Structure 1
Amino acid sequence: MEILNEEKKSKVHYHVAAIINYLGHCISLVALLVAFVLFLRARSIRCLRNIIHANLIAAFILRNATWFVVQLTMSPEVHQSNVGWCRLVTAAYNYFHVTNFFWMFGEGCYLHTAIVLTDRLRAWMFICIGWGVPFPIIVAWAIGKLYYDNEKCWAGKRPGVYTDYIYQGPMALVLLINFIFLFNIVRILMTKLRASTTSETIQARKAVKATLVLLPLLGITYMLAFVNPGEDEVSRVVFIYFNAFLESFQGFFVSVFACFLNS
């Protein structure tokens, strides 16, 4: 009755949220690609720093690419069926999510080192952190799903289940360490490198201004994932649209961030 009319009103708004997410993800993907080819054409791709940038962009490409395959996973018949390719698709998306955290940390390792110590060889340690450390973490996560939580294509949320901390705990830990780095870069930039005009110092200043802008942009969407707003009609609709706009345009935010640093 009127209950059904209320049910139909929510399906339309969810279908609207779904449209915002699909269009934001297409625009983000094209943008990352256009940034990626701009970096590869440059003869400055030999600079360690541009090596770091190209790997970050690539990392966000694979994630946004596999988001499309994930949507095809969210069919409820597929969700319950627990097919092999279905769990494999979920671990792929999780692996790429971890790499995005470890590559943002990598940029923070380079910037703290570049302002304290005066390229093709040093990059391997960054590639070892960005792509390498994540692989055993996802693997350990997977064995934990297999022995203990083999359901819902590994995308189920269930209470009292700590299995997802195997990979989530690391993501928080490197973020903690990037905060210490930020405080040290600012601490250093304001006392000892106050008057420096060396080329590494001007670049450092441009980063810290940019990082201060991107951090609230990217940070909001993560705290919103804890909100639990409620069944209030007006509060619920705004919660769903804002969160869908922030998650989908995220890669677009990153591509602007990356090209700005090319200067």
Structure 2
Amino acid sequence: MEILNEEKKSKVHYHVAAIINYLGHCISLVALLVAFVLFLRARSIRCLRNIIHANLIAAFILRNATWFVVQLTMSPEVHQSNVGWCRLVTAAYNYFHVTNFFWMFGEGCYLHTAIVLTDRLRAWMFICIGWGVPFPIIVAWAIGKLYYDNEKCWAGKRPGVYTDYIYQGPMALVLLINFIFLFNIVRILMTKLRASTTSETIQARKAVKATLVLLPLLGITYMLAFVNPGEDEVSRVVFIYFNAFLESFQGFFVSVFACFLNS
């Protein structure tokens, strides 16, 4: 009875969230594609810092394209079947997720180095950190999933296992190191380089300002994955819709960020 009509209402709001989520991901993917070809066209594609931007954009394209494939594994039949291609899709998606953190760390490392030390050879260091280091981490995590949690296409939540820390711990650690980089960049920009106007100084204050704007935008998304929303109807629907808008436009925000630093 009145339970069922309360159940039908939720299906609407969940179905609405799903539509926000598909829309945002399509807009983000087109925005990253447009930003990618813009970078590839410029002659400035040979400067180290534009190599870093374009690889960063590529890493986000792969993650956002893979999200669509992931949606085809959230079928209950597929999810319980734990078929092989089903686990390979989940691992590829987590790999790309780890490369997103490690390329942002790549951006932080370059910015800290550019103001402290006066291109195609040096790039290999960033390629190795951004695409390379996550590969053994994901392999390690997959060996973990095999012997201790081989279910649900490896996308299960099961209380007590920490197999996912194998790839989540490295993520938090490079974020922690980027925080140290940021304090020293601000520290250096505000003591020694207060009166400076080297080209790499102007463009560095632009980065710091843009990073300070982006950081809260992206930060809320990850802290909300820890909140228990609550049973208030107003509380649930708003939690569900705010989260779906922020998660799904992440790719859009990053493409804006990257194009801004092209200037």
Q: TM-score, normalised by structure 2?
A: 1.00
Q: Offset at 1:46?
A: 0.2
> C-alpha offsets along residues 217-238 of structure 1, whole Å, 9 cap, x if unaligned?
0000000000011121110000
Separation in 2 of the partners of 1:248 and 1:156? 21
Q: Offset at 1:77?
A: 0.1
SS at match of 1:249: helix
> C-alpha offsets along residues 67-95 of structure 1, whole Å, 9 cap, x if unaligned?
00000000000000000000000000000
Q: Offset at 1:30?
A: 0.1
Separation in 2 of the partners of 1:120 and 1:35? 21
Separation in 2 of the partners of 1:83 and 1:14? 27
SS at match of 1:74: coil
Percentage identity across paired residues of the two chains: 100
> C-alpha offsets along residues 132-180 of structure 1, whole Å, 9 cap, x if unaligned?
0000000000000001100000000010010000000000000000000
Separation in 1 of the partners of 2:12 and 2:191? 56
Unaligned runs of 5+ in 1: none
Separation in 2 of the partners of 1:202 and 1:195? 11
Q: Which residue of 1 aligns with 2:213?
A: 213
Q: Offset at 1:47?
A: 0.2
Separation in 1 of the partners of 2:222 and 2:86? 25
Separation in 1 of the partners of 2:73 and 2:86? 6
Separation in 2 of the partners of 1:160 and 1:50? 43
Separation in 1 of the partners of 2:94 and 2:28? 19
Q: Which residue of 2 aligns with 1:197?
A: 197
Q: Offset at 1:19?
A: 0.2
Aligned length: 263
Alignment of 1:135-154 (within 5 A): 135-154=135-154
Separation in 2 of the partners of 1:101 and 1:252? 16
Unaligned runs of 5+ in 2: none
Separation in 2 of the partners of 1:189 and 1:79? 51
Separation in 1 of the partners of 2:198 and 2:232? 55
Q: Which residue of 2 aligns with 1:117?
A: 117
Q: Which residue of 1 aligns with 2:47?
A: 47
SS at match of 2:229: coil
Separation in 1 of the partners of 2:13 and 2:162? 33
> C-alpha offsets along residues 182-213 of structure 1, whole Å, 9 cap, x if unaligned?
00000000000001110000010000000000
Separation in 2 of the partners of 1:142 and 1:131? 17
SS at match of 2:72: helix
Separation in 2 of the partners of 1:164 and 1:2? 40
> C-alpha offsets along residues 120-139 of structure 1, whole Å, 9 cap, x if unaligned?
00000000000000000000
Separation in 1 of the partners of 2:250 and 2:95? 18
Separation in 2 of the partners of 1:40 and 1:110? 20
Q: Which residue of 2 aligns with 1:73?
A: 73
Superposition RMSD in Å: 0.3
Separation in 2 of the partners of 1:223 and 1:234? 20
> C-alpha offsets along residues 7-66 of structure 1, whole Å, 9 cap, x if unaligned?
000000000000000000000000000000000000000000000000000000000000
Task: Give every structure 1 segment of 4 or more consecutive aligned residues whose post-TM-superposition deviation is greater than 2 Å.
Answer: none
> C-alpha offsets along residues 234-255 of structure 1, whole Å, 9 cap, x if unaligned?
1000000000000000000000
Separation in 1 of the partners of 2:73 and 2:63? 15
Q: Which range is displaced more, 11-20 or 229-238? A: 229-238
